[PDB]
Design an enzyme around this catalytic site. Structure first.
Site, PDB file in Angstrom:
ATOM      1  N   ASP A 181      10.476 -18.562  -6.295  1.00 27.31           N
ATOM      2  CA  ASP A 181      10.353 -17.262  -6.973  1.00 27.31           C
ATOM      3  C   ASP A 181       8.962 -16.652  -6.780  1.00 27.31           C
ATOM      4  OD1 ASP A 181      13.011 -17.195  -8.017  1.00 27.31           O
ATOM      5  OD2 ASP A 181      12.386 -17.021 -10.086  1.00 27.31           O
ATOM      6  N   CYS A 215      16.061  -9.697   2.967  1.00 26.57           N
ATOM      7  CA  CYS A 215      15.642 -10.291   1.711  1.00 26.57           C
ATOM      8  C   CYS A 215      15.846  -9.227   0.642  1.00 26.57           C
ATOM      9  CB  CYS A 215      14.209 -10.792   1.825  1.00 26.57           C
ATOM     10  SG  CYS A 215      12.999  -9.652   2.577  1.00 26.57           S
ATOM     11  N   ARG A 221       9.782 -11.925   3.524  1.00 27.71           N
ATOM     12  CA  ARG A 221      10.482 -13.088   4.094  1.00 27.71           C
ATOM     13  C   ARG A 221      11.179 -12.743   5.401  1.00 27.71           C
ATOM     14  NH1 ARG A 221      13.308 -14.895  -1.686  1.00 27.71           N
ATOM     15  NH2 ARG A 221      11.354 -14.705  -2.874  1.00 27.71           N
ATOM     16  N   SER A 222      11.824 -11.586   5.455  1.00 22.51           N
ATOM     17  CA  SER A 222      12.504 -11.175   6.678  1.00 22.51           C
ATOM     18  C   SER A 222      11.522 -11.087   7.836  1.00 22.51           C
ATOM     19  CB  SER A 222      13.192  -9.819   6.477  1.00 22.51           C
ATOM     20  OG  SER A 222      14.281  -9.866   5.554  1.00 22.51           O
ATOM     21  N   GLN A 262       4.160  -9.385   3.685  1.00 21.96           N
ATOM     22  CA  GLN A 262       3.741  -8.621   2.508  1.00 21.96           C
ATOM     23  C   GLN A 262       2.460  -9.137   1.850  1.00 21.96           C
ATOM     24  OE1 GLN A 262       7.801  -8.816   0.479  1.00 21.96           O
ATOM     25  NE2 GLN A 262       7.208  -6.776  -0.211  1.00 21.96           N
TER      26      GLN A 262
END
Ligand SMILES: O=C(c1ccc2c(c1)OCO2)N1CCCCCC1
Length: 282
Positions: A181, A215, A221-222, A262
């Site tokens: 998370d 994502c 994440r992508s 990110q």
């Protein structure tokens, strides 16, 4: 510089935030005018994440052709990817229309439906064989065929039917279920094992349309997934694998979709994955 020793040099000097900010300063800026039209407000999950006009995927529809999705085309590596946001309640039909029209074999999902107590994407595939889904706005039917649940990820076989023509296709759903998370994984080992499973399926190969990867926003994440795949492929293709420059590859990918990777922690994790993955290949 090489990668593994550039890596230890940034760790010892604690300069990951400065490296990552350089990338953000040098990244391409292109228009995203279609995304910002008022009629498309409920087609975007986040107001600050938009596809560029020049690389956006168009739906084959004359009313409204817009989806928050981008084609990342890597010329030297000879790989393409579609990066998109997690579908919204009002875009699940568009998502599967894109899968159909682009002839994709696989969907890669890197998030859970709920994270941090909030919904990160719609429940856009069926959970039981006998309870199929029909998307009336785009005239598609989707059925769960089988499901294989492992400790870090799940693979599903799905049947997608175009109800207009009665054609059917088999789509593979690769779902990474254990990204934390907060932060990034401590070891890249399970992420790499997951990448290799996607590769082994044929879903990334030129005999199919581009894989669809998502994502929640389709950039973090992508971005890590396609950056690691492309860098490892280039290390196999080139006479000198130490010439692969992960920052340059990332800036190239950012010509096609904004914001890929990110946080400085994601950047570091991407380095770690490529470094460890290069040892296993040989
Ligand atoms: O169902 C498909 C299929 C899937 C996606 C496609 C497609 C065909 O054409 C366009 O996009 N296959 C093809 C081979 C893999 C397994 C057998 C069946």
């Amino acid at each position: 510089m090489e990668m593994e020793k550039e890596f230890e040099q940034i760790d010892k000097s604690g300069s990951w935030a400065a490296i990552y900010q350089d990338i953000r300063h040098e990244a391409s800026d292109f228009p995203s005018r279609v995304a910002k039209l008022p009629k498309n407000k409920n087609r975007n999950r986040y107001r600050d994440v938009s596809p560029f006009d020049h690389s956006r995927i168009k739906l084959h529809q004359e009313d409204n052709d817009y989806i928050n999705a981008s084609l990342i085309k890597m010329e030297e590596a000879q790989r393409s990817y579609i990066l998109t946001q997690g579908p919204l309640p009002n875009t699940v039909g568009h998502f599967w229309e894109m899968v159909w029209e682009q002839k994709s074999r696989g969907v890669v999902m890197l998030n859970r439906v709920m994270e941090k107590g909030s919904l990160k994407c719609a429940q856009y595939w069926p959970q039981k064989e006998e309870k199929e889904m029909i998307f009336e706005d785009t005239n598609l039917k989707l059925t769960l065929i089988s499901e294989d649940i492992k400790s870090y990820y799940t693979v599903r076989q799905l049947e997608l039917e175009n109800l207009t023509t009665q054609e059917t296709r088999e789509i593979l759903h690769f779902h990474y279920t254990t990204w934390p998370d907060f932060g990034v994984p401590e070891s890249p080992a399970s992420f790499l094992n997951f990448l290799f499973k996607v590769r082994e399926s044929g879903s990334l190969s030129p005999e199919h349309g581009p894989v669809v990867v998502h994502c929640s926003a389709g950039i973090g994440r992508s971005g890590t997934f396609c950056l690691a795949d492309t860098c490892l492929l280039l290390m196999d293709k080139r006479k000198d694998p130490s010439s692969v420059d992960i920052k340059k590859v990332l800036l190239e990918m950012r010509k096609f979709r904004m914001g890929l990777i990110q946080t400085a922690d994601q950047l570091r994790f991407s380095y770690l994955a490529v470094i460890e993955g290069a040892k296993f290949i040989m």
